[PDB]
RNA sequence: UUUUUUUUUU
RNA sequence: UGGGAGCGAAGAUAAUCUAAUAUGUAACUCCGUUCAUGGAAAUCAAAAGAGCUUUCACUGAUUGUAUUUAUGAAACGUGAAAAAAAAAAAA
RNA sequence: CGGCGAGAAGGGAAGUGUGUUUCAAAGAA
RNA sequence: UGUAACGGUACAAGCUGUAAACAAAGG
RNA sequence: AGGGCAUGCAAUACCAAUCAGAUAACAACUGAA
RNA sequence: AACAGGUGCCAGGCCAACAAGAAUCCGAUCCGUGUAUUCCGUAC
């Protein structure tokens, strides 16, 4: 249910970021000079700033919720529990860990 | 016209036209030649395929059937009270033992002249016969 | 014929059989690898041997004898200073 | 050798030391390939990595676990510094990005926060501190 | 046209049956059924008099 | 005019649009059963590239 | 069979992207206006279209619409050659293909040594021969946001046509009304727009192609159709041109239908030639000469030299051919001898001159 | 080598779909029997419907793993169980042909791809994963992914995925024959009706003469008399 | 001259 | 898989022996087979003319290489099957 | 009662006598 | 994918996977 | 396919110079497949 | 080839959910699809 709203929100944010980056580059290109155009661009960037911040405020809740099962849960593991409806996960490869010398100890 | 009507309707092929066929039919009718075998055969073939406009994939009639084939149920269409004719009272006599004298007779100049006929007359005769021999059974209400 | 830059001038416009049955010991001198279509070697892939690689050759005496032997290329060790990399590259096989 | 080369088949590469070219490689999509072992399952490796550890800046968007408790002092100091010295979201890696350059090239002072706001990392911050 | 003929032609679109391909010829043997085939399993012998 | 057309010939004369004499023009013709029409008095001549070199 | 090299290249057709469902952003992602690709928020960052500027510099170009099946290095040399006309080219960069490093994506960057030199290359587009798929290149200035004229050719064509039609109409008018004033006759001429055919006053095509009314008449094919006469027969701005035109009379030339047609036809070919020549300038104009070594080097970048016959000799099959045949060697010796005799004839002309 | 020819010849038989059609003629015999049949093994594992087991439905989102399309996402259009194949839009286009209709001169069509060469993407993760069915207390069936453990979306409507098959149309047109002549193509119902009328008189006329202006009459058909 | 292709009406 | 690429000896024939055939055959490594291989002329022919590539038949066991033993689907040419120059400046 | 838009790279190959023929090393299913 | 080990079944060239021969009834 | 389904076959390759192993700081250091 | 299976052994008319004879004579024990004669169904 939540995925669908997340999608759209994301898309919108994506678009707004590209427009804001284009406006910032245009403003930077004409630093040593003053004109009406520069003011216009500043105004539009100002607008888009809020227009974008609102999106992130709205988005925050969804991202957390969505990314629920992505991470492991000991509670749901066959090791720490025996209740019906188990959950399994695949081991990752962390160079930071793999490059280190560690003994097969458990305590 | 009979030879050409059977050819394809492609670019690289000579084929007559419908109005040309009617003009030729009238021209032949005028000279007491309307009853032409080749003309009738070409006319039938021309309308057999809408003058070559209609096209269908190559179709071959089946000469054999597989074992345990499909079954289709259908009632008899022949009007009631009709049955095939029965043979004679038991059997015919032997061919070599009994039928040795009746199978042979003296020849005549008429027989010689009939034997000395050409193939086209025979073919025409056959065609006419088959044409004439086309009949169907009638119904009570049809009469 | 076509592709004159490449070896096999007298082999293109011939019978299939000739091509299939062509022997390798009929050629005395070596042939360039680029022209011959030979695959690159592992030692070449690890260095800069622009037109150089392992080749083969055959011998012949007055007694109509023939053999085949392997020959290695000529490689040198040097040092190159790359301005873009901003680091020296010692021991470059060239 | 039997057949001569041409204008299209005169350049070759080593069997092992070569450049992948799926676009210019023989393949049979309409055929079963046992070599690839379609039955065998494979894990999901992280997309973003920093100092050998998962990138903390990509967590808010992409999610995933963080091995914060496995970090050493050395790693943790730099990690901390990273998150303190005006972090940017574009510093993370990309999966098959467009051929054109990325925004990371410039990395100038922007007037907005890309992807997420700075307020979305206190959870991680706490852990970092604890680890410290 | 004949009424009977019309009736008959009415059923032209009915489903057909199976048939063989053009020029279908059944393969038949010439040689006898008796021949040593000692490269066969136990239960697959055909020798009677040879 | 007296040519005994075979299968091969017939195929060409029936398939390839270049043999269509009903729409023949000396200034615009195909090359070999092609779909696109070429300019005979133009296409037969060379031309120079952006660099000014012959092509 | 073995691993292919850079010689072997394959490319398939691309199916156009159509969004069947507008409310399904999952299965039908929205396209991007910058990268021309599907919006991947999950793994791709937003672009701005000015990243190359911070890399190279302000004085840069954005060339797009490149062919396929060509090496990046070859494209770089071609581009350098092309661009060298204007000024000194700094560096040329090409983005390889995503799935094919040996292939070009379709975009490239060009850097110039100067601002004005760069500015001059933005005016007109780049046209490629058949060899290159006839791919028209699109340029853009990152420092100015200036684009090229992609429709130049197509607009010129219509101008040509309009010229033809104006000539015809003038002729007709002359025929129907005898000689007419120069300043008065011109008012009965019209042209049509390139985008959509709309009746307009003549003169845009004249100014485009010919450049002047006077020139129109002074042209090669045009002069055989009409005749101007000075007032006594019976470096100029618009006002002066008009004033001169005010006191002249046009006289037609008696011609047949076939001749007229022929002339009309000829005019078009001439005009077309003009257009072609404009776009097909050389790459070695106002430049010093080059050594033969350099020339050879240049050649090498496109074409390879033939293999020595010494080596080729060995290729002979022993089954049907003799390896070392005295007659075969003698034939080649005679050919080599004849080559010098052929060369002497060409060399004698320089001494004679 | 002097065995390539024969080798190839022999090999061809394998691919050959013997027996082949053969029309009869006058004093001519078939040769199909003389053609050896291909060699095949019987004892082998039984086939399986991978489509059914993988929980893969038409209209689902898939991504290409190998081939030219190293990374490319699409929508499943068609599934063939017997061949164990799928058709994915905008992928694997190699079959080209002449335009049978309005448009350019050449048109291409997508080709089927092995089911094994594709996988189902994760909803949220957007990575290849597995999907399992689960039944509720009420009998409601729900498709749940492995990675994210989330519910799968519904398939796309068939009305949106319906497209015309021009390859089939081209094959149908080719099956008939070359294009018709302009001259022949022109209709002529006025004379066609006269020819059709004469056809019935010729066929069902029983040799009777045609009508005339002076004698506008024709003999009636004769029935089939029974054998008394 | 000693021949020959059946549908009319999805 | 007698398909393609690298390397690649001997028993045997020549009534021992060299070349030569076996054979570029066997073993080893790699590509994994019509969605393949190949390819749209600086070719062939000689005063005529054919017109990318690929399969079959005949020419023909002719020409050629060898000789003490063999090997050789040669080139031009004819018949037949299948027929394919390029979708294309952008939106 | 048919009359000079009369041209299309200057390079490859073929007899070694070439006023002759052909071609363009450089494009996609 | 194809196979080997242990356990159960009637210790077996079968079946089966500690839930080791079945859920068939969601108001 | 409602539900369940220990263990072994040495597995970051749904990707990426080569050379041991949970796949090796440069160099030493080499290559017909 | 009515080899399509079974029924005690060789079955178009018997079991097999849709057509068609418990058919007559002969038979060592001994059923008996078997010999002789004859009827019927069939777009099987």
DSSP codes joined into one string, G287-302? -----HHHHHHHHHTT
Per the listing, tokens 């485009």 go with: G208
Rounded distance, CA B41 to CA B3, Å?
10
> Considering CB atoms only, which of D70, D111, D120 is closest to A24?
D111
Determine contact, residues E19/B62, Cβ cutoff 8 Å.
yes
Q: In sequence order, what are the residues at sequence separation of 6 or more whose Cβ sits closer than 8 angstroms to the Cβ of residue D48?
A: D54, D55, D57, D58, D62, D92, D93
Determine contact, residues D121/D83, Cβ cutoff 8 Å.
yes
Count of other CB atoms within 10 angstroms of residue G188: 15
Collapsing DSSP to helix, strand or coil, G17 comes out as coil
β-pairing, C55-60 vs C66-71, is: antiparallel
Q: What are phi and psi of D42, to 5 degrees?
A: -130, 150
In F1-55 the beta strands, taken as DSSP E runs, fall at 28-29, 38-39
Determine contact, residues G87/G113, Cβ cutoff 8 Å.
yes
Determine contact, residues G323/G314, Cβ cutoff 8 Å.
yes
Q: Which two tokens stand for residue G50?
A: 């000015």
Per the listing, tokens 């991680």 go with: D124
Per the listing, tokens 């042909």 go with: H97
**Residue B106 vs residues B98, B109, B111, B121: alpha-carbon distances, Å:** 19, 10, 10, 25
Length of chain G: 353
Nucleotides of K under 7 A from a protein CB: 5, 7-10, 14-16, 18, 25-29
Rounded distance, CA H114 to CA H91, Å?
12
DSSP, res G147: B
Q: Which two tokens stand for residue H215?
A: 């004698």
- Omega prior to H19 cis, within 30 of 0: yes
Q: Which two tokens stand for residue G319?
A: 């089954």
Determine contact, residues H103/H82, Cβ cutoff 8 Å.
no
Residue environment code for G92-111, b if the CB has 16+ CB neighbours within 10 A, otherwise e: bbbbebbbbebbbbbbbbbb
H134 sits within 7 Å of strand M by its CB = yes
H47 sits within 7 Å of strand L by its CB = no
Q: Which two tokens stand for residue G292?
A: 């033969």
Dihedral, G155, G158, G163, G169 alpha carbons, nearest 10: -150
Chain H residues whose CB is inside 8 A of the D35 CB are none
What part of F 8-47 touches G (C-beta under 8 Å)? 47
Rounded distance, CA H18 to CA C52, Å?
54
Contacts within 8 Å (CB) and 24+ apart, F5-12:
F5/B12, F10/B12
Residue environment code for C15-31, b if the CB has 16+ CB neighbours within 10 A, otherwise e: eeebbeebeeeebeeeb
Dihedral, C14, C19, C24, C28 alpha carbons, nearest 10: 10
Task: Tell which residue, H151, B98, C30, has the closest CA to residue A68.
Answer: H151
Number of B:H CB contacts under 8 A?
A: 82
**Distance from chain centroid for Cα H96:** 16
Chain D residue nearest residue H116, CA to CA: D38
Left (φ > 0), alpha (ψ -120 to 50) or beta: where does G286 sit?
left
Q: Which two tokens stand for residue H163?
A: 């497209």
Rounded distance, CA H101 to CA D50, Å?
57
Rounded distance, CA G165 to CA A75, Å?
87
E7 sits within 7 Å of strand N by its CB = no
Residue environment code for B50-61, b if the CB has 16+ CB neighbours within 10 A, otherwise e: ebbeeeeeeeee
Dihedral, G46, G52, G55, G60 alpha carbons, nearest 10: -160
Count of other CB atoms within 10 angstroms of residue C12: 15
B18-30 and B37-48 are packed helices; what angle lies between their axes, rounded to 10 degrees?
160
Rounded distance, CA G221 to CA G265, Å?
10
Q: Which two tokens stand for residue A45?
A: 């960037």
Q: CA-based angle G105:G108:G111, to the nearest 5? A: 165
In G120-181, alpha helices (H): 152-177
Rounded distance, CA G342 to CA G339, Å?
5
How far is the first Cα of chain G from the last one, in angstroms, to the nearest whole number?
A: 59
How far is the first Cα of chain A from the last one, in angstroms, to the nearest whole number?
A: 42
Count of other CB atoms within 10 angstroms of residue H68: 22
Determine contact, residues G139/G148, Cβ cutoff 8 Å.
yes
β-pairing, F28-29 vs F38-39, is: antiparallel
Kindly tell me the sign of the dihedral angle through the C-alpha atoms of A90, A93, A96, A98.
Answer: positive
> Considering CB atoms only, which of G307, G316, G319 is closest to C4?
G307
Dihedral, H6, H7, H12, H15 alpha carbons, nearest 10: 160
Q: In sequence order, what are the residues at sequence separation of 6 or more whose Cβ sits closer than 8 angstroms to the Cβ of residue B137?
A: B78, B79, B82, E4, H223, H224
Chain C residues whose CB is inside 8 A of the H1 CB are 17, 20-21
Chain H residue nearest residue F10, CA to CA: H178
In H89-184 the beta strands, taken as DSSP E runs, fall at 93-98, 106-110, 113-114, 118-121, 128-129, 131-135, 141-145
Rounded distance, CA C12 to CA G312, Å?
12
Q: Which two tokens stand for residue B1?
A: 């016209």
Determine contact, residues H77/H161, Cβ cutoff 8 Å.
yes
Rounded distance, CA H211 to CA H217, Å?
6
Residue A16's H or E segment, with its range, is helix A2-29
Rounded distance, CA G171 to CA G179, Å?
10
Chain G residue nearest residue F48, CA to CA: G280
Residue to test with chain H: of F10, F14, F30, F37, most H Cβ within 10 A: F14
Per the listing, tokens 């994760």 go with: H122
Collapsing DSSP to helix, strand or coil, G21 comes out as coil
How far is the first Cα of chain B from the last one, in angstroms, to the nearest whole number?
A: 40
Q: In sequence order, what are the residues at sequence separation of 6 or more whose Cβ sits closer than 8 angstroms to the Cβ of residue H52?
A: H81
Rounded distance, CA C8 to CA C4, Å?
8
Collapsing DSSP to helix, strand or coil, B9 comes out as coil
F50/G127 Cβ within 8 A: yes
Residue G329's H or E segment, with its range, is helix G326-352
C-alpha distance from G134 to closest chain F C-alpha (Å) = 11
Rounded distance, CA A35 to CA G192, Å?
41
Chain H residues whose CB is inside 8 A of the E27 CB are 33
> Considering CB atoms only, which of B18, B57, B136 is closest to H188?
B18
DSSP, res C38: P
> Considering CB atoms only, which of C8, C39, C46 is closest to D4?
C8
Q: Which two tokens stand for residue A81?
A: 């529990």
Determine contact, residues E18/B66, Cβ cutoff 8 Å.
yes
Rounded distance, CA C9 to CA G307, Å?
9
Q: In sequence order, what are the residues at sequence separation of 6 or more whose Cβ sits closer than 8 angstroms to the Cβ of residue B120?
A: none
In H111-227 the beta strands, taken as DSSP E runs, fall at 113-114, 118-121, 128-129, 131-135, 141-145
Q: Which two tokens stand for residue B77?
A: 């269409």
> Considering CB atoms only, which of E1, E2, E25 is closest to H30?
E25
Task: Tell which residue, G207, G242, G238, G214, has the closest CA to residue G228.
Answer: G214
Count of other CB atoms within 10 angstroms of residue C60: 11
Collapsing DSSP to helix, strand or coil, G202 comes out as coil
Rounded distance, CA E18 to CA F13, Å?
39
Chain A residues whose CB is inside 8 A of the D103 CB are 21
C56 sits within 7 Å of strand M by its CB = no
Which nucleotide's C1' is closest to H111 (Cα)?
A: J35
Determine contact, residues F51/G82, Cβ cutoff 8 Å.
yes
Count of other CB atoms within 10 angstroms of residue A47: 12
H189-203 and B18-30 are packed helices; what angle lies between their axes, rounded to 10 degrees?
50
H45 sits within 7 Å of strand L by its CB = yes
Determine contact, residues D77/D129, Cβ cutoff 8 Å.
no
CA C26, C1' M31: Å apart? 27
β-pairing, G190-192 vs F38-39, is: unpaired
Determine contact, residues G39/G29, Cβ cutoff 8 Å.
yes
Dihedral, C76, C81, C85, C86 alpha carbons, nearest 10: 150
Q: CA-based angle C34:C40:C42, to the nearest 5? A: 155
Collapsing DSSP to helix, strand or coil, H38 comes out as coil
Determine contact, residues H168/H95, Cβ cutoff 8 Å.
no
Q: Give the experimental resolution in Å.
A: 2.9
Chain F residues whose CB is inside 8 A of the B12 CB are 5, 10, 13-14
Rounded distance, CA C43 to CA C73, Å?
10
Rg, C-alpha atoms of chain E: 25
Task: Tell which residue, D31, G65, G38, G132, has the closest CA to residue H92.
Answer: D31
DSSP, res B102: T
Task: Tell which residue, D124, D1, D15, has the closest CA to residue D64.
Answer: D124
H189-203 and B37-48 are packed helices; what angle lies between their axes, rounded to 10 degrees?
120
Rg, C-alpha atoms of chain F: 16
DSSP, res D89: G
In chain F, alpha helices (H): 7-15, 40-43
Rounded distance, CA B63 to CA G184, Å?
90
Rounded distance, CA H145 to CA H74, Å?
18
Whether there are 3 or more C-beta pairs closer than 8 Å between A and E is no
Rounded distance, CA C66 to CA G78, Å?
50
Count of other CB atoms within 10 angstroms of residue B112: 9
C14–D contact, CB cutoff 8 A = no
CA C20, C1' J37: Å apart? 15
Rounded distance, CA G245 to CA G231, Å?
10
Determine contact, residues H198/B24, Cβ cutoff 8 Å.
no
Rounded distance, CA B124 to CA B117, Å?
12
DSSP, res C50: T
Task: Tell which residue, H120, H109, H107, has the closest CA to residue H76.
Answer: H120
Rounded distance, CA B87 to CA D99, Å?
95
Q: In sequence order, what are the residues at sequence separation of 6 or more whose Cβ sits closer than 8 angstroms to the Cβ of residue H181?
A: B9, B10, B11, B13, B15
Determine contact, residues A15/A55, Cβ cutoff 8 Å.
no
> Considering CB atoms only, which of H70, H93, H153 is closest to G12?
H93
A10–G contact, CB cutoff 8 A = yes
A11/G41 Cβ within 8 A: yes
Task: Kindly tell me the burial class for residue B78, based on how many C-beta atoms sit within 10 Å of its own C-beta (0-12, 13-18, 19 or more).
Answer: exposed
Task: Tell which residue, G269, G250, G230, G258, has the closest CA to residue G171.
Answer: G250
Rounded distance, CA G224 to CA G171, Å?
11
Collapsing DSSP to helix, strand or coil, D61 comes out as helix
In C1-94 the beta strands, taken as DSSP E runs, fall at 55-60, 66-71, 77-82, 87-93
Residue H182's H or E segment, with its range, is helix H182-185
Chain A residue nearest residue D60, CA to CA: A63
Task: Kindly tell me the burial class for residue E17, based on how many C-beta atoms sit within 10 Å of its own C-beta (0-12, 13-18, 19 or more).
Answer: exposed
E20–H contact, CB cutoff 8 A = no
Dihedral, H123, H129, H131, H132 alpha carbons, nearest 10: -130
Determine contact, residues H157/H132, Cβ cutoff 8 Å.
no
β-pairing, G60-64 vs F28-29, is: unpaired
How far is the first Cα of chain E from the last one, in angstroms, to the nearest whole number?
A: 69
Chain E residue nearest residue B137, CA to CA: E4
Task: Tell which residue, G233, G126, G219, has the closest CA to residue G166.
Answer: G219
Q: Which two tokens stand for residue H226?
A: 């029974």
B102 sits within 7 Å of strand N by its CB = no
Rounded distance, CA G240 to CA G238, Å?
6
β-pairing, G199-201 vs G190-192, is: antiparallel
In G17-151, alpha helices (H): 51-55, 72-83, 115-119
Rounded distance, CA D21 to CA G9, Å?
10
Chain H residues whose CB is inside 8 A of the B17 CB are 183, 188
Rounded distance, CA C3 to CA C5, Å?
5
Per the listing, tokens 């498709």 go with: H143
Task: Kindly tell me the burial class for residue B18, based on how many C-beta atoms sit within 10 Å of its own C-beta (0-12, 13-18, 19 or more).
Answer: buried
Determine contact, residues D79/D71, Cβ cutoff 8 Å.
yes
Determine contact, residues D116/D89, Cβ cutoff 8 Å.
yes
Residue environment code for H142-164, b if the CB has 16+ CB neighbours within 10 A, otherwise e: ebebbbbebebbeebeeeebeee
C-alpha distance from B18 to closest chain F C-alpha (Å) = 21
D23/G100 Cβ within 8 A: yes
């Amino acid at each position: 249910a939540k995925q669908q709203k997340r999608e759209a929100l994301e898309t919108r944010r994506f678009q707004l970021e590209e427009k804001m980056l284009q406006l910032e580059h245009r403003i930077r290109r004409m630093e040593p000079a003053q004109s009406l155009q520069k003011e216009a661009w500043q105004a539009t960037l100002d607008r888009y700033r809020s227009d974008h911040e609102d999106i992130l405020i709205q988005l925050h809740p969804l991202r957390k919720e969505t990314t629920q099962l992505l991470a492991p849960d000991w509670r749901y593991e066959r090791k720490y529990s025996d209740l019906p409806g188990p959950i399994r996960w695949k081991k990752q490869y962390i160079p930071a860990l793999e490059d280190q010398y560690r003994k097969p100890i458990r305590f | 016209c009979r030879a050409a009507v059977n050819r394809p309707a492609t670019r690289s092929y000579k084929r007559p036209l419908a109005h040309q066929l009617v003009e030729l039919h009238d021209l032949m009718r005028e000279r007491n030649l309307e009853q032409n075998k080749a003309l009738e055969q070409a006319v039938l073939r021309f309308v057999a395929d809408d003058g070559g406009c209609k096209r269908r994939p190559r179709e071959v009639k089946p000469l054999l059937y597989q074992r345990n084939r499909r079954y289709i149920s259908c009632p008899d269409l022949i009007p009631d009270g009709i049955e095939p004719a029965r043979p004679c009272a038991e059997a015919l006599p032997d061919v070599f033992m009994e039928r040795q004298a009746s199978l042979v007779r003296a020849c005549t100049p008429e027989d010689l002249a009939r034997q000395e006929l050409p193939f086209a007359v025979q073919a025409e005769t056959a065609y006419r016969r088959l044409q004439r021999n086309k009949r169907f059974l009638r119904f009570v209400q049809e009469e | 014929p076509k592709n004159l830059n490449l070896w096999g001038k007298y082999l293109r416009l011939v019978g299939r059989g000739a091509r299939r049955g062509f022997k390798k010991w009929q050629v005395i001198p070596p042939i360039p690898v680029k022209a011959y279509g030979r695959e690159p070697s592992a030692a070449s892939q690890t260095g800069l041997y622009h037109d150089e690689d392992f080749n083969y050759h055959t011998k012949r005496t007055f007694s109509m004898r023939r053999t085949r032997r392997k020959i290695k290329p000529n490689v040198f060790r040097r040092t190159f200073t790359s301005s873009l990399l901003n680091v020296t590259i010692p021991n470059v096989r060239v | 050798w039997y057949t001569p080369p041409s204008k299209r088949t005169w350049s070759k590469q080593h069997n092992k030391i070569f450049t992948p070219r799926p676009l210019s490689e023989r393949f049979s999509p309409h055929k079963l390939h046992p070599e690839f072992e379609w039955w065998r399952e494979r894990t999901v490796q992280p997309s973003a990595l920093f100092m050998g550890f998962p990138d903390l800046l990509a967590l808010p968007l992409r999610g995933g676990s963080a091995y914060i408790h496995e970090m050493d002092a050395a790693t943790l100091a730099v990690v901390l510094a990273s998150l303190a010295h005006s972090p940017s979201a574009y510093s993370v890696s990309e999966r098959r990005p467009p051929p054109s350059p990325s925004p990371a090239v410039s990395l100038s002072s922007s007037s907005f926060s890309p992807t997420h706001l700075p307020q979305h990392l206190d959870s991680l911050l706490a852990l970092l501190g604890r680890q410290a | 046209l004949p009424l009977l003929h019309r009736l008959i032609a009415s059923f032209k679109n009915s489903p057909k049956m199976e048939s063989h391909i053009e020029g279908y010829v059944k393969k038949k043997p010439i040689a006898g059924r008796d021949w040593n085939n000692l490269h066969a399993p136990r239960k697959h012998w055909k020798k009677m008099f040879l | 005019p007296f040519v005994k057309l075979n299968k091969a010939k017939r195929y060409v004369l029936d398939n390839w649009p270049s043999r269509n004499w009903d729409d023949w023009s000396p200034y615009r013709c195909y090359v070999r059963g092609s779909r696109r029409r070429y300019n005979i008095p133009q296409d037969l001549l060379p031309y120079k590239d952006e660099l000014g070199e012959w092509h | 069979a073995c691993r292919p090299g850079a010689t072997r290249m394959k490319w398939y057709f691309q199916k156009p992207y159509v969004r069947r469902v507008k409310s399904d952003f999952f299965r039908f992602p929205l396209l991007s206006q910058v990268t021309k690709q599907k919006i991947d928020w999950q793994y791709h960052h937003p672009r701005s279209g000015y990243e190359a500027a911070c890399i190279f510099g302000p004085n840069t170009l954005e060339v797009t619409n490149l062919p396929m099946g060509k090496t990046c290095q070859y494209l770089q040399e071609r581009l350098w050659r092309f661009f060298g006309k204007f000024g000194i080219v700094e560096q040329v960069r090409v983005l390889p293909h995503e799935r094919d490093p040996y292939q070009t994506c379709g975009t490239a960057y060009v850097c110039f040594r100067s601002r004005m030199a760069s500015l001059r290359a933005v005016r007109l587009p780049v046209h490629l021969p058949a060899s290159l798929h006839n791919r028209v290149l699109h340029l853009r200035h990152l420092g100015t946001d200036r684009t090229s004229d992609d429709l130049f050719y197509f607009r010129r064509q219509q101008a040509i046509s309009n010229l033809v039609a104006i000539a015809q109409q003038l002729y007709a008018y002359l025929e129907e009304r005898g000689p007419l004033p120069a300043h008065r006759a011109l008012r009965l001429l019209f042209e049509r727009s390139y985008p959509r055919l709309a009746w307009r006053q003549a003169g845009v095509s004249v100014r485009t192609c010919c450049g002047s009314w006077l020139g129109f008449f002074s042209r090669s094919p045009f002069n055989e159709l009409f005749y101007l006469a000075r007032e006594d027969e019976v470096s100029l701005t618009d006002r002066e041109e008009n004033a001169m035109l005010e006191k002249m009379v046009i006289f037609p030339h008696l011609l047949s239908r076939e001749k007229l047609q022929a002339l009309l036809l000829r005019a078009g070919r001439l005009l077309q030639m003009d257009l072609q020549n404009e776009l097909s300038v050389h790459w070695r104009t106002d430049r010093p000469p080059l050594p033969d070594w350099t020339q050879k080097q240049i050649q090498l970048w496109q074409h390879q030299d033939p293999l020595p016959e010494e080596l080729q000799i060995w290729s002979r099959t022993k089954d049907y051919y003799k390896i070392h045949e005295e007659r075969f060697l003698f034939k080649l010796k005679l050919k080599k001898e004849r080559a010098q005799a052929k060369q002497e004839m060409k060399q004698q002309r320089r001494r004679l001159e | 080598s002097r065995y390539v020819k024969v080798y190839r010849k022999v090999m061809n038989l394998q691919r050959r779909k013997t027996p082949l059609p053969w029309t009869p003629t006058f004093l001519e015999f078939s040769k199909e029997p003389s053609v050896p049949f291909p060699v095949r093994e019987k004892l082998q594992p039984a086939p399986i419907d991978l489509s059914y087991y993988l929980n893969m439905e038409v209209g689902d989102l898939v991504e290409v793993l190998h081939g030219p399309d190293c990374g490319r996402q699409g929508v499943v259009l068609s599934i063939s169980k017997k061949r164990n194949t799928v058709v994915v839009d905008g992928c694997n286009m190699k079959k080209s042909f002449w335009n049978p209709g309005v448009g350019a001169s050449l048109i291409t069509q997508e080709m089927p791809i092995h089911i094994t060469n594709v996988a189902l993407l994760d909803p949220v993760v957007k990575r290849p994963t597995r999907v399992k069915r689960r039944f509720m207390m009420n009998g409601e069936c729900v498709r749940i992914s492995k990675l994210s453990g989330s519910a799968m979306p519904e398939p796309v409507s068939t009305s949106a995925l319906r497209q015309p098959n021009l390859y089939q149309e081209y094959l149908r047109q080719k099956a008939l024959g070359p294009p018709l002549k302009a001259s022949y193509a022109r209709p002529d119902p006025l004379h066609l009706k006269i020819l059709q009328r004469l056809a019935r008189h010729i066929s069902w006329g029983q040799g009777s003469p045609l009508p005339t202006a002076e004698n506008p009459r024709v003999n009636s058909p004769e029935p089939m008399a029974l054998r008394r």
